[PDB]
Symmetry: D2
Subunit: 285 residues, 4 copies
């Protein structure tokens, strides 16, 4: 059916770096990866300068998705759908719009709106049944479309692995392609997720988050098929930005320390300047 | 009149890091800077994954400007206006829109549309008079609005410092607040720009570009008042992204090398997570 | 001392036609009105072709706002905010955004999300305190901004006029500038709202609606200050398009029905083709 | 074998009403037409309240397109591309964007930037080869895409019908699917374009325009295949808004002129309030 399906087949567990925009999406594709995750958290920070505090609207992740699609046309793009922007009807519209934005899948959550990062302090969740219907709602919207449907549960934090899990299996029944139990606290937890969730499983790596950091081979072992590395891109970026700007402020110059930036061979290699010069010429007289 | 004016007074030459979005704009403000430059080149790469090859529309830099404004409300934001999006009438509309997008100034160019980076291989320029009118056009649109009007000339590349310069003085007559002679090849050139251009002068530092890299004290000396450091932010970003993603691809994990990313103390310190938690609480019962 | 407060004083009942894009805002401003309301209902239809089902997002409403505002830069423009996009924080990003988008007011509503129209079949409502807090939040985010705040309650249908009224009064105390009890069913019910809600009051005229149709001069008498005429524009528009496109479809041309469309001088009068040609020549 | 090529074959002259947003696209589709044209003129007015002065950007036209497309997902939608946003590269980003936005064709024009309308006072034109190349570029960017390409020439006013014609033929050879000589002044001039331009031909009906008003069945006879009826919608609309808002302003209410606005079942018929209520109940 799906590119995720044909992707989780061809490989063991698929590593899907988190992306916050076109340049990052570009770098991800260029580095060989076959999938990428439009991260709400990242998009919030990068696009709006906002904490993952449920301020980012469904409309905005769509705009960002459209750009990221265009910029990395090959990358199999999966989008952070948060709450899914309302009730069933909102979800469906949102789904339809992401299919038009060129994406190939969603994550949708358990949380009360407005939501927070799954590794953040004070989350709450709607009754399972209520979200089940939304999965069901997205399911119908997707139809034949090439669209992977990940149902996420933030239930562990306030209710423990038990709750989180049963919700996972319920969303699977509802018609999800795969399941995502957010923020397992350790290995044991992870492995326990793997034993009592029916079908394909996600797992989200967050540097300094609440889960142990593992590899596609290690996850294949534990039985997780899609690995979102959500904040790698943004987190790297933020350091680099703070570093270079400090250097800039106190010297007033990059002049001395240029090993922090990139080359033009490289930057333009990155974006294919030469490649364009070529197209441009095909069309003068 | 302007915040640039009152800024170029309070300081000698103002260092204005180039910005490509909210997160970067945020980091710039947070690091003490008093000004920032919405770079078309950066916005192209970051927002669209596109080379500075004149594909970015006036409408898009406006959207980006609006976000960057909101995200760094204090930063005195100056926008890369490229060609200015058409003829006089387009410029005016564009100007009006940037004033609404919360910005405080523009750079507008000499180039034939579609334009290219000022440090790029094959640029062309419209007759001086033609651009003079556009400066004049923006001038009237600005009125009392708090808006700094930098007129840029890309004439050096294809016609030499002479042409570039006379164009500079002409755009000054036309009503520009300050003047920008793009891509002086060396010090001598710079200093020559400073001797025969009447009034306030810009200077653009591009890492590995065609100009020598200098500091606000050094520029104050040479007589340049506004220093755009256009590609620092984006260039740092691109390295960091390529680095981390390579590491990610070949290990499948950041686990070992976490000194490349940022902390949560730090990331959230960056965006003020705690600060939000505080506002959020003011309003529960 | 907000612009609207000013308008409600210079006049007695401000009449505020609904508007759903740039052209309609223009026509509205060109017609002599001083205030205009961005209708979420209208906008779903005009801008997205969607029933008023709480699909139109807060992002969408703002874009919509921006254009309306630029095109009709004098109209005191007031935005239907529906639910406010979620919690008090979402409300606050939204007020900020709207202020940035050139508006001077919002209406914020009682309803569960996703909201429905105000004269539509199924409506539920969040606990009054919850909205009182959103209002409050709104208020703080408004600060000095010239931005008239309207608290709407949709409680009348599910709960009777009493609730509608206490909630209005509750929301006034939480710092709205004016209060809107949706869908009084008739004159008595208006007068009752007028008698029992303290402060500035909104009425909302919708043709075919549950509330009876009345004029400013009359409303002035019934103690109402801000009359939304929300769906008129979209409604006139919709009929116009349906008629013409029938003709165009059946007769294959407009040839015989030209008096349906507007005039060159007329149209240009609405969008100023002479104001432009001039500015254009000034800079040739 | 593009959708439009299909439409021009199933029928003889395709009649393609102009449309400037979601509601109008809807009405147009709901009325039985199979094709619709996104009018840049219309859109400047409706969406931004701007004279057709080449202010509407390529970005703007696309957003506009997307909405129109979703709301009217069967209408074979064809976009007024004006100048194409600049050089051949800009043309190409634009074709891509439009294909992504769900369209099935564009019209690309001869004019210097910034363009004006096609029946407006001052018009100049770029060297034919320059546009031929843009067309070509367009063509390549189109590839397999179901996307009917129209090359428009505005040379008739500044240069006479001869230039208009050679340029059309020039642009056909550069790989447009159809050709549009703007503003033949009358029947003779149409027939002359019909006789001297090779391939598929566009005519563009504008009420008050320079070209005389004719029907598909007639145009079929004069050898034209795609008739834009570009400004009708906006024009009907504009009159509708001006009348109503006069009434609303003078009488203070719509109370006495209700037959100007549309019906609840009617309106909802255009935007499907029953289709929704149903999907809604399916998931409660
Ligand atoms: Mg998220
Ligand atoms: Mg630039
Ligand atoms: Mg509403
Ligand atoms: Mg046009």
């Amino acid at each position: 059916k799906t590119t995720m399906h044909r992707l989780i087949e061809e490989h063991g567990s698929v590593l899907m770096p988190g992306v916050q925009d076109a340049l990052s999406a570009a770098v991800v594709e260029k580095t060989g990866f076959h999938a990428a995750f439009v991260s709400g958290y990242s998009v919030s920070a990068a696009m709006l300068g906002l904490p993952d505090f449920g301020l980012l609207t469904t409309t905005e992740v769509v705009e960002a998705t459209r750009r990221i699609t265009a910029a990395a046309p090959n990358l199999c793009v999966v989008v952070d759908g948060d709450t899914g922007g309302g009730g069933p009807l909102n979800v469906q519209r949102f789904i339809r719009e992401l299919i038009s934005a060129g994406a190939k899948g969603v994550f949708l959550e358990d949380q009360v709106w407005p939501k927070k990062c799954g590794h953040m302090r004070g989350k709450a969740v709607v009754p399972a049944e209520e979200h089940a219907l939304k999965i069901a709602a997205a399911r119908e919207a997707i139809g034949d479309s090439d669209f992977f449907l990940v149902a996420r549960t933030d239930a562990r934090a306030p209710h423990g692995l038990e709750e989180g899990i049963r919700r996972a299996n319920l969303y699977k029944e509802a018609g999800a392609d795969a399941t995502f139990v957010e923020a397992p606290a350790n290995v044991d937890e992870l492995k326990e997720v793997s034993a009592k969730t029916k079908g394909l499983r996600i797992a989200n790596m967050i540097e300094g988050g609440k889960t142990p950091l593992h590899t596609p081979e290690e996850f294949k072992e534990m039985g997780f098929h899609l690995i979102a590395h959500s904040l790698t891109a943004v987190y790297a970026t933020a350091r680099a930005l703070v570093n270079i700007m400090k250097i800039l402020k106190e010297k007033g110059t990059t002049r001395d320390d240029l090993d922090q930036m990139a080359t033009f061979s490289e930057f333009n290699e990155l974006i294919s300047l030469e490649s364009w010069y070529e197209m441009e010429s095909k069309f003068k007289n």
